[PDB]
Amino acid sequence: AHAFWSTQPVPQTEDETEKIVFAGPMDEPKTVADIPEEPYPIASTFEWWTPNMEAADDIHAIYELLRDNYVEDDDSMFRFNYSEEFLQWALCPPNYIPDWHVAVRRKADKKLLAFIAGVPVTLRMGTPKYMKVKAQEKGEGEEAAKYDEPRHICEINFLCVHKQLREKRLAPILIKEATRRVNRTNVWQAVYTAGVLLPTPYASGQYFHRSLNPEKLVEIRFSGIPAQYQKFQNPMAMLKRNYQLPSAPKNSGLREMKPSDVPQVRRILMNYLDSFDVGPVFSDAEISHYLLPRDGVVFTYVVENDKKVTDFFSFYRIPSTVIGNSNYNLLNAAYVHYYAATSIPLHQLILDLLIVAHSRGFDVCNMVEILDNRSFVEQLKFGAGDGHLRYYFYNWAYPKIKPSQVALVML
Numbered sequence: 001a002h003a004f005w006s007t008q009p010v011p012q013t014e015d016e017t018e019k020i021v022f023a024g025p026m027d028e029p030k031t032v033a034d035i036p037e038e039p040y041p042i043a044s045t046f047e048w049w050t051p052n053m054e055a056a057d058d059i060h061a062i063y064e065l066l067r068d069n070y071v072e073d074d075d076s077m078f079r080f081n082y083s084e085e086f087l088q089w090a091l092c093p094p095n096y097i098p099d100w101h102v103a104v105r106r107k108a109d110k111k112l113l114a115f116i117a118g119v120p121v122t123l124r125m126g127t128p129k130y131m132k133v134k135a136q137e138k139g140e141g142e143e144a145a146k147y148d149e150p151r152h153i154c155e156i157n158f159l160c161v162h163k164q165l166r167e168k169r170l171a172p173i174l175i176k177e178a179t180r181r182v183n184r185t186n187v188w189q190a191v192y193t194a195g196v197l198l199p200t201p202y203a204s205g206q207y208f209h210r211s212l213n214p215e216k217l218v219e220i221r222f223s224g225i226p227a228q229y230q231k232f233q234n235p236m237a238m239l240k241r242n243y244q245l246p247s248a249p250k251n252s253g254l255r256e257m258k259p260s261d262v263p264q265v266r267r268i269l270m271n272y273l274d275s276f277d278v279g280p281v282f283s284d285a286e287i288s289h290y291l292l293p294r295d296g297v298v299f300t301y302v303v304e305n306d307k308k309v310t311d312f313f314s315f316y317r318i319p320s321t322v323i324g325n326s327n328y329n330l331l332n333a334a335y336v337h338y339y340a341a342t343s344i345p346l347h348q349l350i351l352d353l354l355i356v357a358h359s360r361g362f363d364v365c366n367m368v369e370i371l372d373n374r375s376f377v378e379q380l381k382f383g384a385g386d387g388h389l390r391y392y393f394y395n396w397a398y399p400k401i402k403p404s405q406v407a408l409v410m411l
């Protein structure tokens, strides 16, 4: 059924995944010397292009390709509209490898036709705790801990083929070439997410949304007035009331993160994340890049009390093109990013996120049920969306885990 994925070092069935007990690579070890130096063959009318992320023009070209040809909902109502500033932020973290950004251009006119992006990530991806002590019960502890140390791997995002070139087996070629460029740097694993089911996810989480400006959401049919709201008249008055938030944060001590916060944010994030089976490890430089506030892009607040950062939350902005619609062109969504609470209940920290998101003009807050995201769903009036984010490894055998054991937020 899978002409491409069947040729690949990923688990091939849900069973394979359910059986696995130890984290480890699938393929036998190779060396950089084993990997072809020459790019993978491509039709003579196309050429491989490595965009420059330091070039506004290259970013612009990538932006346009994604604006018109990237992820849409199942009903072709909405298409994500990642901004140019967002892409520069996502695509160029500290110590990024320019080579891992892989594009196909039409030779004739240099039109961008397809793209895929790899970024470095340090990831804890050793045997999960629930399989690890079961390994102890069976006297298999060292095997279970072989790959406990954080690995410097590749995170894949932004795979996109132009609508005109779809279903011509171009995506497999992109994946092959990306794999090559990554292998050539002595990296053998990748982590990636998708909304579609491919072979074979190690975890899957539902999406959740929290209406911030329900009038607009209903105008654009992101939301339908639930059947039940029509037992009164003015069900848009009641809906508004339902989703109403304060104008100002409730937690004193709440302010924007600043550069001097970096070491303390790092400490408390790392302590929180380390309790999860799969999760990133960040340098100070990475904490700076991913969490310092950045206009239109990422928004980060700390609770400091007595010159001490005790809690933080972050969200990032991804608008979507509303595909028709006379009244509206854009849906303004806040996504829950990294956070940590140590002095207050998480539901109280995240309410403040919602309050801030709302004040600054976001229409909705979204998230996946990873981290401790489930704890605040009901109180904060999140509802489960359609579809799921599926988490995958390339070349890494890994047991099925619950989404609540995953600490890697994907952009």
Ligand SMILES: CCCCCCCCCCCCCC(=O)SCCNC(=O)CCNC(=O)[C@H](O)C(C)(C)COP(=O)(O)OP(=O)(O)OC[C@H]1O[C@@H](n2cnc3c(N)ncnc32)[C@H](O)[C@@H]1OP(=O)(O)O
Residues within 6 Å of the ligand: 001, 002, 003, 004, 005, 006, 069, 070, 071, 072, 154, 156, 157, 158, 159, 160, 161, 162, 165, 166, 167, 168, 169, 170, 171, 172, 175, 178, 179, 182, 183, 187, 188, 189, 190, 192, 193, 194, 195, 196, 198, 394, 395
């Ligand atoms: C060590 C380093 C390793 C580095 C690489 C790690 C792996 C990277 C993995 C990529 C992670 C990306 C993570 C994200 O960015 S997820 C976001 C993906 N982007 C979109 O959904 C945007 C709109 N869609 C498109 O642009 C295209 O429809 C795409 C490009 C998705 C497929 O193009 P197209 O529709 O023109 O089809 P084709 O004829 O070229 O090819 C058909 C083959 O493609 C397989 N397919 C379909 N969708 C996906 C998908 N989302 N991930 C992986 N594979 C996918 C499919 O099963 C089939 O293979 P097989 O079933 O025949 O075997």
Ligand SMILES: CN(C)CCCN(C)c1nc(N(C)CCC#N)c2cc(Br)ccc2n1
Residues within 6 Å of the ligand: 071, 073, 080, 194, 195, 196, 207, 208, 209, 318, 335, 366, 367, 368, 385, 386, 387, 388, 389, 409, 410, 411
């Ligand atoms: C962590 N994260 C979901 C980032 C993804 C942002 N995007 C593009 C996104 N994607 C979504 N999907 C792919 C759902 C399709 C399935 N299965 C998505 C789905 C919903 Br529902 C709400 C927000 C979303 N936002």
Ligand SMILES: [Mg+2]
Residues within 6 Å of the ligand: 161, 165, 166, 167, 168, 169, 170, 171
């Ligand atoms: Mg294709």
